[PDB]
Design a protein around this nucleic acid. Structure first.
Ligand SMILES: [Mg+2]
Ligand SMILES: [Mg+2]
Ligand SMILES: [Mg+2]
Ligand SMILES: [Mg+2]
Ligand SMILES: [Mg+2]
Ligand SMILES: [Mg+2]
Ligand SMILES: [Mg+2]
Ligand SMILES: [Mg+2]
Ligand SMILES: [Mg+2]
Ligand SMILES: [Mg+2]
Ligand SMILES: [Mg+2]
Ligand SMILES: [Mg+2]
Ligand SMILES: [Mg+2]
Ligand SMILES: [Mg+2]
Ligand SMILES: [Mg+2]
Ligand SMILES: [Mg+2]
Ligand SMILES: [Mg+2]
Ligand SMILES: [Mg+2]
Ligand SMILES: [Mg+2]
Ligand SMILES: [Mg+2]
Ligand SMILES: [Mg+2]
Ligand SMILES: [Mg+2]
Ligand SMILES: [Mg+2]
Ligand SMILES: [Mg+2]
Ligand SMILES: [Mg+2]
Ligand SMILES: [Mg+2]
Ligand SMILES: [Mg+2]
Ligand SMILES: [Mg+2]
Ligand SMILES: [Mg+2]
Ligand SMILES: [Mg+2]
Ligand SMILES: [Mg+2]
Ligand SMILES: [Mg+2]
Ligand SMILES: [Mg+2]
Ligand SMILES: [Mg+2]
Ligand SMILES: [Mg+2]
Ligand SMILES: [Mg+2]
Ligand SMILES: [Mg+2]
Ligand SMILES: [Mg+2]
Ligand SMILES: [Mg+2]
Ligand SMILES: [Mg+2]
Ligand SMILES: [Mg+2]
Ligand SMILES: [Zn+2]
Lengths: 69, 83, 116, 23, 181, 97
RNA sequence: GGCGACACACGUGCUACAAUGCCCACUACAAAGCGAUGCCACCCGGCAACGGGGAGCUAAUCGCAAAAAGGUGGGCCCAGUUCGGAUUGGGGUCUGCAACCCGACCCCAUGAAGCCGGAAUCGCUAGUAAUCGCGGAUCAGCCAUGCCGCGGUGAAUACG
RNA sequence: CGCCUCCUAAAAGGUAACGGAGGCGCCCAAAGGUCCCCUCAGGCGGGACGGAAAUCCGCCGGAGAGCGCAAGGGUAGAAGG
């Protein structure tokens, strides 16, 4: 590589919020991120962050069967 | 919306013709003036004519239109814009 | 893109900041800081990083927010517009939905006046 | 102001009660 | 050649599963990565403030490599484009920096994407290469909210030695590329 | 803008446009015609064309009658012109010391 | 079913565009009215609308009832914001045979326009204007921000 | 009305008409000398904003691009970048 134009790559820590730490390389030796592949809901299986809903409507109402048959 | 303590309202005279069709191998076309009646699941799959004040509108009930009223599907005002 | 994907303002208190999130109002701001035991009057510039991911964790796991919320609200307006019910028609035309008079006003739904 | 239901002043304007104006 | 986990994962895990999935008879036949070409079609800096040096300072932090200036082929009146004008940045990543970039790309960048639901499975070259665009540059771990000024995305070309899209789908998915379909 | 009321009577959009074109004679005086309001009506002997218009210098109120509706309209404009030209020039009279 | 429609246009009003302000907690000070399938104390459940218990009062006795502005304390720090509360998604309550068209209210979320308004134009001469709440008729409920009343705080100016 | 290009012009050169069509009266301090390096237009597929067409990637693609300006000749094994 040409000299004096490229940011030097050094060994680097990456600390995600989920405690996962990656041993990679970067121009910054230590970086904090809010998410990573180890915890992101698309990555960690069908980790439905909230809406493990199912249908949900238009029948799980069932309030109720009091009308006659 | 209606209190949950009260029931899911159907005019009873419409609910009856639903089950007689269910318990015999439906369907015949149902004419009705019961805009106020809820679309209970036993109705799913029928086609019912709703009076809008002028015409009885054929409304095919599907699975995703249950917690609703029959009037919502036979609108009353003809409007096509201005100009 | 701190929490939750929205870079909430520093300089402001936590309860006030978290309102700058799609899905979190004054009510849910009280709920997040009690359930994680954070002083609701602490500026975002002063949250210990332990506090942040503590606050971040509870918020994102409890409630639907930003994109997932917006996709859902749209999906409900979409299904209303597909099943052809009356409210769906009002969304089809951009007219109001909750029974308001349209002979005048309704400028929020219609937009600024179109001359003739 | 008075037109805001989620405040005390709004519930006073309407004559109603709730979480933001208890009785 | 540095020891980077993605490169090691390529040789130790990825290659054996590829040989087994396709039955290659020569070690040079198994798909590998040729290069990763990052491109910014800036153009919002054509005349305005040709101080895209802001962006070159960014891509250099992201890749450890100084990007090079792309200049307009012909002149285009509707785009307000004079032949020769500087309209973006291309940086070509190979060998360890290519691995080092892709390593952080799969681990950190793609997860930070807004409402991320996986890479587009249909974006393949038809000859075994892949391409994806980005909407922002904060996606990367080195570019913080403080230092940024404007929202500039990029194109990323992933060039493999695979002759077909299927072999390339296999290689990239095995490296940790999250596809939705 | 200009409003037209047909009291206890139905008129066409053509008739309304004739009225707007006839009131356009008042644009001669190059003064703001503010919310002009015409009322066409039917009495047992003929039609009545009323009008109320405000200008920066005063208001105009006039009523025209005739068997023929257009003539009653025209008579209205004549009475409205004479008032407008009075509003626009009466101040010039007491000018010399 | 419509009278509630909606490319538009005008009249009357409500809430505002903020710091003489907004929010929360605590604490004062009225008048006139209404009230026996009525007004509801107080207790319990619910964040709440409300629900279940249940006393009192044919009512200067019991109840609607808390008046609000104000006072005290704390927050907000000039940003389309802790200004503003439109619009919409979702969840409930209650009346009523029935709330799709087309009810009011509560709760979560959404959080629009609006930065004081062109030509033009209205009211008001003193407890008035301005501002703050309270009550009643109609009334199952309510589209009342209307109307008829009631008190609280309380000005400016009139040469001519 | 002088000059350039093509045709008329009858396969050397030349060849007329108030015959058929276009251009010139500049320009360039590099658009000149040399050395080194590089190769087009276009089609298809892929890629945030981004489009028929901006920039990126892959495959095909001998010259249809380019060569300041008319036309012709020439030309990438460069006269083009
Ligand atoms: Mg060297
Ligand atoms: Mg050297
Ligand atoms: Mg919010
Ligand atoms: Mg309404
Ligand atoms: Mg006020
Ligand atoms: Mg508010
Ligand atoms: Mg090898
Ligand atoms: Mg493909
Ligand atoms: Mg390939
Ligand atoms: Mg980053
Ligand atoms: Mg009119
Ligand atoms: Mg005349
Ligand atoms: Mg009706
Ligand atoms: Mg009416
Ligand atoms: Mg309406
Ligand atoms: Mg009009
Ligand atoms: Mg009003
Ligand atoms: Mg006012
Ligand atoms: Mg300001
Ligand atoms: Mg805003
Ligand atoms: Mg604005
Ligand atoms: Mg606000
Ligand atoms: Mg709702
Ligand atoms: Mg209704
Ligand atoms: Mg004001
Ligand atoms: Mg004026
Ligand atoms: Mg007087
Ligand atoms: Mg009142
Ligand atoms: Mg009532
Ligand atoms: Mg010749
Ligand atoms: Mg010849
Ligand atoms: Mg010859
Ligand atoms: Mg010779
Ligand atoms: Mg000649
Ligand atoms: Mg010439
Ligand atoms: Mg040079
Ligand atoms: Mg090409
Ligand atoms: Mg293409
Ligand atoms: Mg695109
Ligand atoms: Mg393109
Ligand atoms: Mg050529
Ligand atoms: Zn993580």
């Amino acid at each position: 590589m040409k000299e004096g134009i490229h940011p030097k790559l050094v060994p680097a820590r990456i600390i995600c919020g989920c405690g996962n730490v990656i041993e990679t390389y970067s121009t910054k030796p230590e970086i904090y991120v809010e998410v990573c592949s180890k915890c992101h809901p698309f990555y960690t299986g069908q980790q439905r962050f909230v809406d493990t809903e199912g249908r949900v409507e238009r029948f799980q109402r069932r309030y109720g069967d009091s009308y006659r048959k | 919306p209606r209190s949950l303590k009260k029931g899911v309202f159907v005019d009873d005279h419409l609910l009856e013709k639903v089950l007689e069709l269910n318990a015999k191998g439906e369907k015949r076309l149902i004419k009705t003036w019961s805009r106020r009646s809820t679309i209970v699941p036993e109705m799913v799959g029928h086609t019912i004519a709703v009076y809008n004040g002028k015409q009885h509108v054929p409304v095919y009930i599907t699975e995703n239109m249950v917690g609703h009223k029959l009037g919502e599907f036979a609108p009353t005002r003809t409007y096509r814009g201005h100009g | 893109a701190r929490i939750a994907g929205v870079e909430i303002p520093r300089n402001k208190r936590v309860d006030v900041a978290l309102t700058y999130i799609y899905g979190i109002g004054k009510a849910r701001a009280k709920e997040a800081l009690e359930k994680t035991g954070i002083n609701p009057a602490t500026r975002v510039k002063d949250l210990t990083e332990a506090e942040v991911v503590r606050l971040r964790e509870y918020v994102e796991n409890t409630w639907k927010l930003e994109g997932e919320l917006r996709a859902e609200v749209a999906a409900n307006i979409k299904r209303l517009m597909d099943i052809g019910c009356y409210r769906g028609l009002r969304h089809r035309r951009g007219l109001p939905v909750r029974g308001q008079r349209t002979r005048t006003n309704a400028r929020t739904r219609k937009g600024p006046r179109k001359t003739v | 102001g008075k037109g805001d239901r989620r405040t005390r002043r709004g519930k006073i304007w309407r004559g109603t009660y709730g979480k933001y104006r208890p009785r | 050649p540095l020891d980077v986990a993605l490169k090691r994962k390529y040789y130790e895990e990825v290659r054996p599963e590829l040989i087994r999935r396709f039955g290659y008879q020569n070690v040079w036949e198994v798909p590998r990565l040729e290069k990763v070409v990052i491109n910014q079609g800036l153009g919002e800096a054509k005349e305005d403030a040709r101080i895209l040096e802001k962006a070159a300072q960014e891509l250099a932090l992201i890749t450890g490599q100084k990007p090079a200036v792309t200049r307009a082929k012909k002149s285009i009146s509707n785009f307000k484009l004079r032949k020769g004008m500087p309209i973006g940045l291309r940086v070509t990543l190979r060998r360890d920096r290519m691995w080092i970039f892709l390593e952080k790309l799969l681990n950190v960048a793609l997860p930070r994407i807004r409402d991320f639901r996986g890479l587009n499975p249909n974006s393949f070259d038809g000859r075994g290469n892949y391409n994806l665009g980005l909407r922002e540059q904060l996606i990367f771990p080195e570019i913080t909210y403080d230092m940024v000024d404007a929202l500039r995305g990029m194109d990323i070309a992933v060039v493999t030695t695979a002759e077909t899209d299927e072999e390339a789908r296999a290689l990239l998915e095995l490296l940790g590329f999250p596809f939705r379909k | 803008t200009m409003n037209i009321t047909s009291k206890q009577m139905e008129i066409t959009p053509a008739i309304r446009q004739h009225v707007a074109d006839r009131l356009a004679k008042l644009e001669k005086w190059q003064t703001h015609l503010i919310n002009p309001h015409i009322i066409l009506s039917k009495e047992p002997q003929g039609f009545v064309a009323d009008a109320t218009i405000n200008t920066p210098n005063g208001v105009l109120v006039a009523s025209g009658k005739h068997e023929d509706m257009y003539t009653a309209i025209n008579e209205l404009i004549n009475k409205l012109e004479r008032q407008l030209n009075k509003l626009q020039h009466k101040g010039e009279a007491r000018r010399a010391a």
